[PDB]
Amino acid sequence: PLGVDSSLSFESVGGLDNYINQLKEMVMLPLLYPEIFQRFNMQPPRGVLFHGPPGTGKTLMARALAAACSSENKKVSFYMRKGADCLSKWVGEAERQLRLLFEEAKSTQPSIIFFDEIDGLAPVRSSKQEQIHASIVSTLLALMDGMESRGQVIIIGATNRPDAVDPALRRPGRFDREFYFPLPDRDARKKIIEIHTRNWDPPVPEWLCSMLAEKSKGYGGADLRALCTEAALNSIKRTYPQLYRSTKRLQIDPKTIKVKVKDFVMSMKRMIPSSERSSISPSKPLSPELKPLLNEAFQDIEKTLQKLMPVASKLNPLEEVMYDDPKENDFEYQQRLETFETLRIYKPRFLICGRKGLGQTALGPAILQQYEGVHVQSFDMSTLLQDSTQSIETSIIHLFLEVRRHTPSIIYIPDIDNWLNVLPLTAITTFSSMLERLDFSDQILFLALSSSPLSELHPQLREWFSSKQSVYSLQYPTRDSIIAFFQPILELIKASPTELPGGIPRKRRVLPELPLAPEDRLTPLKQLLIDSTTGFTVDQLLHLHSFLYQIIWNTKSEWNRNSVVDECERAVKEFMI
Amino acid sequence: PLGVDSSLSFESVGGLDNYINQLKEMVMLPLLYPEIFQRFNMQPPRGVLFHGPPGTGKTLMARALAAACSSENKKVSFYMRKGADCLSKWVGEAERQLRLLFEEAKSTQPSIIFFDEIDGLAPVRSSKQEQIHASIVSTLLALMDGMESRGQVIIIGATNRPDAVDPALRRPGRFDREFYFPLPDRDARKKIIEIHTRNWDPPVPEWLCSMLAEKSKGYGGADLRALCTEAALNSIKRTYPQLYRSTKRLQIDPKTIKVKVKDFVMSMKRMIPSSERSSISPSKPLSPELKPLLNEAFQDIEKTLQKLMPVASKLNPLEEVMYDDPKENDFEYQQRLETFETLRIYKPRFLICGRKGLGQTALGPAILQQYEGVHVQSFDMSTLLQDSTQSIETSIIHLFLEVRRHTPSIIYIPDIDNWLNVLPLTAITTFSSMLERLDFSDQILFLALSSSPLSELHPQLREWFSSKQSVYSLQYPTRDSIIAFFQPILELIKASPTELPGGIPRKRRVLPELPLAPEDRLTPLKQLLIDSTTGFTVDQLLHLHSFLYQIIWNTKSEWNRNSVVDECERAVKEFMI
């Protein structure tokens, strides 16, 4: 059956190395080196506040910390407190459980305590309720620190939000660490999936990683293990159909090890993402047959993206201090590199103008997918009108405040032709103010999408975007790209009966026992598809593509060729209306 | 008298086979096959969240699960928890009932627990109330899972809504199953009604099923049994009138078994649907005498419906894996069928333009009835203005979000001539945005009804619906269809006195004892009804139809024919004003 483990070698949360060194410098040093705390007479406190996606290192870095320190040294004890679990309606009974737990935590000397659900442990301190909201918060203040020199004990905090509570709970000088979980995307995703998949006596192929790791976006350690179990059970029922209706119990052979990539892709048909349980995010790669239709400008988007903003990230200070320099006295040499790759910028924004039905609003999610690791959100007016409890301008100042409270991050607005007709001049001039409230010298991108083409626009954008390179206009694709797009189906006309299942028999499987345990017109069709379709829009090409898919689906079984051209050609004739 | 049963062989919820195999793979395997959980070292968790219409498998799949596992293996215990039933205002008393129940649930090893009313068990976790809302939620988190390796115990959840609570209650990795109940419509409706009706020593006829099963729409297992009891008691009082006023008690014969279809149709006169206790849904089949007046285009509606969207549903993977293929390494062969019957589409919509009084707004419910099994709702502005607590555009984004959170589903708007005058340009451009927020490549229908005819319309629809086949215009019916419609009453003129009750005597029934227990002008009338009614509208034909019904009702008793033509003909003369 099932079972939980108490040993973790960072094998389901693995990849947060700089976090690991940051916590090692907090928890290892005070009793590893007990001398330099008097050589300098130094304090440094301990305590980390987790925030980010839950289960992406919430329970997983809980096991990574208890397993980390248990694998670190002997002896050491560990404590798990998950929200309100020692409380009452009394103050003086709730708390007497709490500080009996505190005094026994102080009695056991090598000891850490996990505290999760810090909102449930201590909410915001308001006096418009009963005074236990002030009482347990103040008594946790004095009983964690302030009055209480805790000595050798370590207090761990975890939330989903870094600001779900009043900042008195983060007194600066006791809880000076806060860890954000960035949900690793591609490479530590491939690391975390391959450190999972080696727990099987069949080793997995490594062409499927980072193939499956780039398919899997928005997942924790546990649900990627759920992908492991669902592909596993797909191998189970796949290998054996006789898994049903057993009152007389059965026995098995132990040689039931067969693995498919079909198991994984059926798991992808049968999955659901964790972030996409309640969200809608445009995390959509560009369509692979549409790459003949948009790679040619997509390259210009990613190159001019790279030029108008470097996407350069921070290296590890471990290897940086593994390097050494000779000169260390020169703050002028410091302000040199502090000017380097920092003062090279000015106000990241970009605009897309082009016709409707011409590759719109898919390239947006595509260039969202062409690089990751950055923080990003968009001013979707669905996400702006989603609350009415406050003003929408209060929501504007809020969301501008949180994208201010990040890394160099990404801001997007779709459909600005329809937008600015949606909200009044309150929110308009609000936004135009908030455009200028921040500096040029920070790196926040401002992607902008319009479904209307150029030189016809209200000038609100124009005074905002008077740079000649702050915009790009779109054109029709070339005929060679067109015939590149219709190429594969133009040989799928010829490969019906046994290449495709239009004429492939599907046969039955027998049950196991599992014993008892007690050609020539192709070119006039070519001049029908080309040169009579005078460079139209790509959605119309999607119409035709769907239509011919219906044609070849209905005409899926045919031998003795050149008999199935009449259906598609009259469909083109009808399409020209 | 009455009595409840503890044995169910899926005989009042029967039809959810793929659900049954999905739960069997969760609950049977961990102790059926206790070896492969170490061959792969796999987790898989257990827990299902029910949502959908209550009593359509809520109590019924509760009995199907406890009866399923009790009929599965010996020995096994079962537990029933229905919302708040072990609580208090204390935290620490409410919970001490809860985890005394948890430790005794862990003590009894073969054990499952039913949890219904999950909102009453654990609401959303807000700190703007007393902190027991955070406390019992967090303590149910740690005491179901997270901290607690539950071992062998199974936790069952059930609601009406899949999102009546915050998604922390669905941690991905413990509650990875959620069952929607689809309210089976025709064939599993006939299966579920015939698996009921075989509980009587008279076997029912099978021409009335699926006749009565297609009459009965929107019912659970229990209320269909209430139809069984009401047709039963209609047979009781029908067979015996002496069922009244007995102080001196009486005795019966046991041979009181007579069954009528009259009992069922009087039950239909005396019924009320469960979904139609507070809703108004246009689930209305087309009128059978109006089938001469709309089948001729109705066929075009269902055929072009079928062409513009295939209604093809998913087969069972049981029989699909009962089939086997030779080639299983080819993800390209996978993306073949993943392109098959998926990329054949483009943006399902359809429009109805036609005159007023000409078959409008009944064909809508009719083609709603011509196929079922799909998810469907409509943007009725009654259902849009029904709340004022939020903005109506917030309701727009909400309802678009939930129809996004479904199967390929159906969207309808009636009366678009009167509509777009009802809501301002806020909701208008909101909706036009939400038209384009989703892809072409998903299958969501967009039925549209207008009471005004063609070529006269504001072009908002026209830029939305510039496809030549995205619309259909309506005409007058033909004279042969007209005389087909007036045909049956044109022989009901001749069949008054004993075919119809206009001259049939109704006689009295005696009481049982039940002893003590201590012609020629028809064709000028034909040229009056036809060719002087120059192809008018069908509501006017309903006027006339009602009028002649009043004529023949008042003239219902007549012998020695050809004396009753004067009343209807002068009614036609008066009607021509």
CB-defined contacts A:B, below 8 A: 199
Distance (Å, rounded) from C-alpha B67 to C-alpha B76?
11
C-alpha to C-alpha distance for A462 and A450, rounded to whole angstroms: 13
- For residue A276, the chain B residues in CB contact (below 8 A) are none
- Residues of A within 8 A of B40 (CB-CB) are 200, 229, 232
Sheet bearing A111-116, strands edge to edge: A77-82, A111-116, A154-158, A48-51, A177-180
DSSP strand E in B33-184: where?
48-51, 77-82, 111-116, 154-158, 177-180
Search chain A and give the residue with CA nearest B335: A265
CB pair distance less than 8 Å for B337 and A385:
no
Residue with the two structure tokens 């108490």: A6
What is the spatial distance between Cα A158 and Cα A121, in angstroms, rounded to a whole number? 11
Our CA-based measurement puts residue A25 at a distance from the nearest CA of chain B, in whole angstroms, of 27
Pairing of strands A154-158, A177-180: unpaired
Question: Could you tell me which chain A residue has the CA closest to the CA of B434?
Answer: A382
**What is the Cα–Cα distance from B90 to A314, expressed in whole angstroms?**
51
Whether residue A132 lies within 8 A of chain B, CB to CB, comes out as yes
B124 CB neighbours in chain A (<8 A) are none
Question: Distance from A421 to chain B by nearest Cα, in Å?
Answer: 8
Determine the Cα–Cα distance for residues A329 and B247; give it in Å rounded to an integer. 113
Compare CB distances from A82 to B141, B321, B436 and report the shortest one's residue: B141
| Cα–chain center distance at A117 | 23
Q: Would you call A133 and B138 a contact, using CB atoms and an 8 Å cutoff? A: no
How far apart are alpha carbons A441 and A445 in whole angstroms? Answer: 12
* List of chain A residues whose C-beta atoms are within 8 Å of the C-beta of residue B135: 83-84, 87, 120
A132 chain-B contacts, CB cut-off 8 A: 131
Report the candidate in A82, A84, A175, A178 with the shortest Cα–Cα distance to residue A133. Answer: A84
Q: Is B123 annotated as a binding residue?
A: no
A509 contacts on B by Cβ (under 8 Å): 321-324
B523 labeled binding residue: no
Distance CA B559, CA B390 (A): 67
Contact B39 A388 (CB under 8 A): no
Query: B interface mutation test: which of A61, A89, A227, A257 has the most B CBs within 10 A?
Result: A89
* Amino acid letter for position B218: G
List of chain A residues whose C-beta atoms are within 8 Å of the C-beta of residue B127: 119, 123-124
CA pair distance B485, B419, nearest whole angstrom: 33
For residue A31, the distance in angstroms to the closest alpha carbon of chain B comes to: 29
Do the chains contact at A87 and B138, CB–CB below 8 Å? no
Residue B426 assigned as binding residue: no
Preceding omega of B75 cis (within 30 degrees of 0): yes
Chain B partners of A507 at a C-beta cutoff of 8 Å? 323-324
Bridge-based pairing state of the strands A507-508 and B323-324 = antiparallel
**Residue B58 assigned ligand-binding role:** yes
Report the candidate in B334, B71, B26, B292 with the shortest Cα–Cα distance to residue A501: B334
Given a contact cutoff of 8 angstroms between Cβ atoms, the answer to whether A204 and A197 are in contact is yes
Distance CA B315, CA B335 (A): 18
Residues of A in contact with B322 (CB under 8 A): 241, 508-509
Residues of B100-131 as b/e, b for ≥16 C-beta within 10 angstroms?
ebbeebeeeeebbbbbbbbbebbbebebeeeb
* Distances B329 to A262, B93, B319, B463 between C-alpha atoms, Å: 7, 58, 21, 46
Per-residue CA distances from A519 to A483, A498, A524, A554, B60 (Å)? 16, 19, 10, 20, 61
The verdict on whether omega for the bond into residue B260 sits within 30 degrees of 0, i.e. cis, is: no
Which B-chain residues 147-206 have CB contacts (< 8 A) with chain A?
147, 149, 151-152, 163, 167-168, 170-173, 176
CB contact under 8 A, B172 and A543: no
Question: Is B137 within 8 Å of A130 when comparing Cβ atoms?
Answer: no
Sign of CA dihedral A264, A267, A269, A271: negative
Comparing C-alpha atoms, which of A80, A87, A81 is closest to residue A139? A87
CB burial string A298-335: b at 16+ within 10 A, e below: beebbeebeebbeeeeeeeeeeeeeeeeeeeeeeeeee
Helices and strands, counts by H and E, chain B: 24, 11
Residue owning tokens 């009802």: B422
Q: What length does chain A have?
A: 577
B337 Cβ contact partners less than 8 Å away, ≥ 6 residues apart: A501
CA-based nearest residue in chain B for residue A133:
B131
A567 touches chain B (CB under 8 A): no
Instruction: Specify which residues A250 forms β-bridges with.
Output: A516
In the numeric block, which tokens belong to residue B381? 């502005």
CB B208 within 8 A of CB B264: yes
Which residues have a Cβ under 8 Å from the Cβ of B398 and sit 6 or more positions away? Answer: none
Q: How far is CA A159 from the centre of its chain?
A: 18
| Chain A (3-62) residues lying within 8 Å, Cβ to Cβ, of chain B | 3-4, 54-55, 59
**In the 3-class helix/strand/coil scheme, how is B355-372 assigned residue by residue?**
CCCCCCCCHHHHHHHCCC
**Nearest chain A Cα to B142, which residue?**
A82
| Residue of A249, A418, A549 with shortest CB distance to B344 | A549
* Shortest Cα–Cα distance, A248 to chain B (Å): 10
Question: Any chain A CB within 8 A of the CB of B573?
Answer: no
Question: Least CB-CB distance to B37: which of A2, A4, A415?
Answer: A2
- The verdict on a CB contact (< 8 Å) between B328 and A229 is no
CA distance A379 to chain B (A): 14
Rounded to a whole number of angstroms, the distance from the CA of B226 to the nearest CA of chain A is 33
Nearest-Cα distance to chain B for A571, in Å, is 13
Question: Does residue A339 sit in helix, strand or coil?
Answer: helix
Q: Is B346 in contact with A265 (Cβ distance < 8 A)?
A: no
Q: Binding site annotation covers A55?
A: yes
Calpha distance B32→B27 (Å, rounded): 9
Q: Which of B34, B43, B339 sits opposite A229 (nearest CB)?
A: B43
Asked if A87 and B91 touch (Cβ cutoff 8 Å), the reply is yes
**Contact at CB, B139 and A85, closer than 8 angstroms:** yes
How close is the nearest chain A Cα to the Cα of B155, in Å?
15
Decide: A161 and A192 in contact? Cβ < 8 Å: no
Name the nearest CA neighbour of B296 among B472, B540, B536: B472
Chain A partners within 8 Å of B146 (Cβ): 59, 82
The SS3 assignment for A114 reads: strand
Residue pointed to by tokens 């409008």: B360
- Cα–Cα separations (whole angstroms), residue A334 to A59, A407, A484, B467: 40, 21, 53, 65
8 Å CB contact between A118 and A157: yes
Q: Are strands B445-449 and B350-353 parallel, antiparallel or unpaired?
A: parallel
Q: For residue A225, which residues of chain B lie inside 8 Å, CB to CB? A: 43, 173
